[PDB]
Every structure is written in C-alpha cells, then in structure tokens.
C-alpha cells in the first residue's frame, strides 16, 4: 500500500482566490501535500497555468504520469491516460496549454486527475496526487465567469 494524497469528500474544497479583471485564480488544497492552482491572466490569447505547489519541494526531476482516474464511487469505469509531464527539482509542477484545460474538463466530469511519480523524499517510491472533484462545479462556474470578465489585452 503506497502513498496517495487526495482530499476526502468531507475535506475537499475549492476557492476563488483572485477574482479581478486582470487575473483569475482557483485553488484546490490537497491535504498533507499542498495546493493545485489554476491561474489565468488578461492577455490577447487564451492562457491557463496549472501549478502543483508542494509543501516539501520536489527532490529530483521525475517523469510524472497524468491520468483521469475514476473515483471509488464509480465502479465499472476505466481510467483514461491523459499525458506524461516532467516535474523539475525544487520547482512547482507546471502544466500548460490544452492540458490544463483538459484537467479542468476531467474534473468537470466527476473524475480525479491523478499525477503519479516517484518521490525523492519518500525513498524513491511511487506516490499519487489526486485532485478531488467534490464541490468543484460551483467554483468552476465562478472561475469561468471570471475568465469571461478578463481584460482582452495585456
């Protein structure tokens, strides 16, 4: 039995941290691990950053697997592999472009975006970090409302 960092349904919460016409920010605290931050900014072009911020910084650069795992309360559903990222040493994990929008989409479908990788602080053992889709839809609506109200120039 390995390490799996996910917020239980009673622990999951999503918050709109920054709601201004220059930036929108949506934060999901992963208990005992850190935060997952979606940041969009005023620009001429579509942009979204996903940053997995860790309490204990990344020990080594590792290949990370991003999968759309079904939650436990969804039997009979298979997991969709999304992509492979690279998390860098002492830097917050970064996903950008269409993959961050894909993470938001997989959360909108009641699924868990799961990052799996080998943790340096954990004797190089495989660990999972999942984002919970509980209480997500209302904050996703607020985040999209904020995105619609962003200045269209930088």
């Amino acid at each position: 039995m390995g390490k799996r960092y996910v917020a239980t349904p009673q622990q999951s919460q999503w918050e709109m941290v920054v709601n201004t016409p220059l930036e929108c920010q949506l934060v999901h605290p992963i208990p005992s691990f850190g935060d997952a931050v979606f940041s969009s900014r005023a620009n001429k072009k579509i942009n979204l950053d996903f940053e997995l911020k860790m309490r204990r910084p990344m020990g080594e650069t590792r290949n990370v697997s991003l999968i759309s795992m079904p939650p436990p309360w969804r039997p009979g559903e298979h997991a969709d592999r999304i992509t492979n990222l690279k998390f860098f040493k002492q830097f917050d994990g970064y996903v950008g472009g269409q993959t961050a929008w894909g993470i938001l989409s997989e959360l909108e479908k009641g699924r868990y975006p799961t990052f799996s990788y080998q943790d340096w602080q954990s004797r190089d053992q495989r660990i999972e970090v999942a984002l919970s889709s509980v209480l997500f839809q209302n904050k996703y609506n607020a985040f999209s409302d904020c995105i619609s109200n962003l200045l269209k120039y930088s």
Binding site: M1, G2, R4, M69, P75, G76, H78, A79, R126, E128
Partner: protein, 352 residues
C-alpha cells in the same frame, strides 16, 4: 481400445445396447485423456445399430463393435475404437469453474408416495455434486445449497453465488416419478418407474440463465409396492432405478461439459492491497505462476423492466501471478499508475 459396456435392458434391446456402447465410449475417452465435452454430441449419431460408424471432425474416427452379449439379463458390449487426443482446444487453457449445486425439488409429492422417496431430490443433488467434483474435467464443486434459484430474482442469484464463491449455480425440478404396471400370467408384475428432470444453470456474475435441459428415463422398480426405500442407502442406488439415475447424472455432467467448458473462465478480484490483488482461483483450479491476466471492469445492471443485463468496460491493466496458494492466488499489477482503478468484483481472463 479394449473397453466393456454394461447396461440393463428395460423395454428395448436397442436402448440397452446403446447405453452399453455409450458407457464403453465414455470409459475409452476418459482413459485416452480426450475431452469428455465432445461425447455428448456423438450420441445422436449413434441411434443406428450399424456395426461400423464413420465420423468426421472428432477425436474418434471409426467405431467397430466386435462382441455383444446378454449375460445376466444386461447387455455387455465390447468395442475397439481409435481416439486422437488433441493437445489444443478451447477447454485446455482455462481455469476450472466453481459450480454450486442448488436445490433440486420434487414438483409433485404425490408421485413419490410409492417407496416414500421424498428426499430423492436432495440425495440426487448430492450425486450431481460428487459427479461434478470427482468426474468432470473443467469443474470444481463448492458444495450444495438449500435455497431455490429462480430467473425472476437475478439479485438473489448473484448474492448466493457471492456467498458460496460460485461462478455458476445449477438447480432443477423433478417432474415425473410415476410408474406403470406390466402384468403377465406366467410371471409376476413388472413396475417400470419414470424419472424426469429439468436442469437449469444460472450465471452467478449476472444472474442470467445460461443452460436449460430436460431429461427423462425409465427403469424397473424392483422393490415391493408397499416397501419403503431409503434414498441414501445402497439398496436404492444399486437397483435398476439407481443405475438409471446415475446414468442421468453422468449425462448431466457431459452436457455441462459440452456447453460451459469452452466459455472463458473469469476469476474475480477478491481483495486489493495497493499494487497486489487477490484472485478467488488458486492452485487447485489450474493457476500457475507467471500467468498473464487481463482485467475487465464489471458493471452488470438490472434494466428498467427488471431483467438482468451485462456490461464490461475494457481496461488497459494486465496482471501477473506472483504467489500461488491452494485456493487463492496473488497478482501484481503491471501498470502501477492504473492500480487505483481496480475495485473488488472486477473480473480477469488469462491471456493466451
């Protein structure tokens, strides 16, 4: 081969000779190592009493009967046959299927009055259980149950199969135990008693009915009209009626081999401990270390009208056997990142 077939004449010499030939063929196939599933399709083409039989696309090609004798009132048949045991087939690479023998009932207790054979259903389900356990090739018997299995309640069938750990549940109804009297002035009366039976096999994973067949045979009732016969005793099962019922049980086993043997065996996930899962099948079912298995996500629903339905989601997860116990086995998931999507009740099939 050199085989002997023994069968008692009831009303026709042809039927007794055919039964003796079936017995000899069954013994020859069992000794030869050939599959017993294919025998049940050979019998229909054996209705004719020809001295020579020609068959194509079978493990037996030509049958030649050389000796036919009626010693001690029962036909003895000696034949020589050529059996080709195929190393391949859809039945040799599959794990054994666990089967639960359900309740077999007498529909009309009125018919069982003569001899007071009221527990004939239970003592016959015991025989079917032992026949499937110690005579079949692709079946393991997990015991008998006192509950009745019906097609109207797939949920109950699934629950009982889960409780007993059975992939299939087999139950029947005995529909005819009546007898007729044949009278001759020279000799005493002859009582020929009937034994009709309707067997039904249900799939424990989804509650569906996968097998349905009817059997009817007749045999002499050697006991007195007013005599009470115990169905657990050797007096009942060594009589002509007992031999007929044993032959009926053998035919049940051969039909189960003919129908269910080449269905792909689907062991179930019992427990998940991180990256290692447990399988309900073990060493006694044919599991060997290093076997590669493919996982299927199970989702079987009762539809809007109350009828059972099946739905499996294909998975990218492959497992290999790490440790083997007599009744269970441990499997390691080859894709650790997908290990979180494995739940209890998912099925697996061996990769060929």
């Amino acid at each position: 081969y050199e085989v002997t077939g023994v069968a008692t004449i009831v009303s026709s010499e042809e039927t007794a000779r055919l039964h003796a030939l079936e017995d000899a063929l069954f013994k020859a196939v069992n000794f030869s190592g050939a599959d017993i599933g294919s025998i049940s399709n050979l019998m229909p083409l054996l209705e004719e009493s020809r001295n020579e039989y020609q068959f194509t696309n079978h493990e037996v090609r030509y049958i030649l009967v050389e000796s036919e004798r009626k010693r001690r009132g029962k036909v003895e048949v000696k034949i020589r046959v050529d059996i080709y045991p195929s190393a391949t087939g859809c039945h040799t690479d599959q794990y054994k299927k666990t089967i639960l023998v359900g309740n077999i009932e007498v529909a009309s207790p009125q018919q069982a009055v003569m001899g007071q054979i009221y527990q004939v259903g239970d003592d016959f389900s015991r025989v079917v259980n032992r026949q499937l356990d110690q005579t079949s090739r692709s079946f393991v018997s997990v015991g008998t149950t006192d509950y009745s299995i019906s097609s109207n309640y797939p949920a109950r069938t699934q629950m009982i199969a889960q409780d007993n750990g059975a992939q299939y549940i087999i139950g029947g109804v005995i529909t005819d135990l009546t007898a007729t009297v044949e009278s001759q002035l020279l000799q005493d009366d002859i009582i020929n008693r009937q034994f009709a039976l309707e067997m039904k096999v249900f799939d424990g994973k989804t509650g569906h009915e996968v097998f349905n067949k009817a059997y009817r045979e007749v045999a002499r009732w050697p006991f007195a009209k007013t005599s009470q016969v115990d169905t657990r005793s050797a007096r009942f099962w060594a009589s002509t009626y007992g031999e007929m019922m044993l032959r009926v049980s053998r035919n049940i086993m051969l039909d189960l081999e003919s129908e269910l043997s080449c269905k792909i065996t689907l062991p179930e996930v019992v427990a998940v401990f991180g990256n290692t899962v447990t399988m309900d099948l073990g060493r006694m079912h044919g599991v060997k270390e290093g076997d590669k298995l493919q996982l299927w996500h199970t989702a079987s629903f009762i539809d809007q009208n109350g009828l059972p339905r099946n739905k499996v989601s294909q998975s990218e997860i492959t497992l290999t056997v790490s440790r083997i116990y007599e009744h269970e086995a441990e499997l390691t998931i080859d894709q650790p990142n997908l290990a979180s999507s494995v739940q209890i009740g998912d099925v697996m099939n061996k990769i060929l």
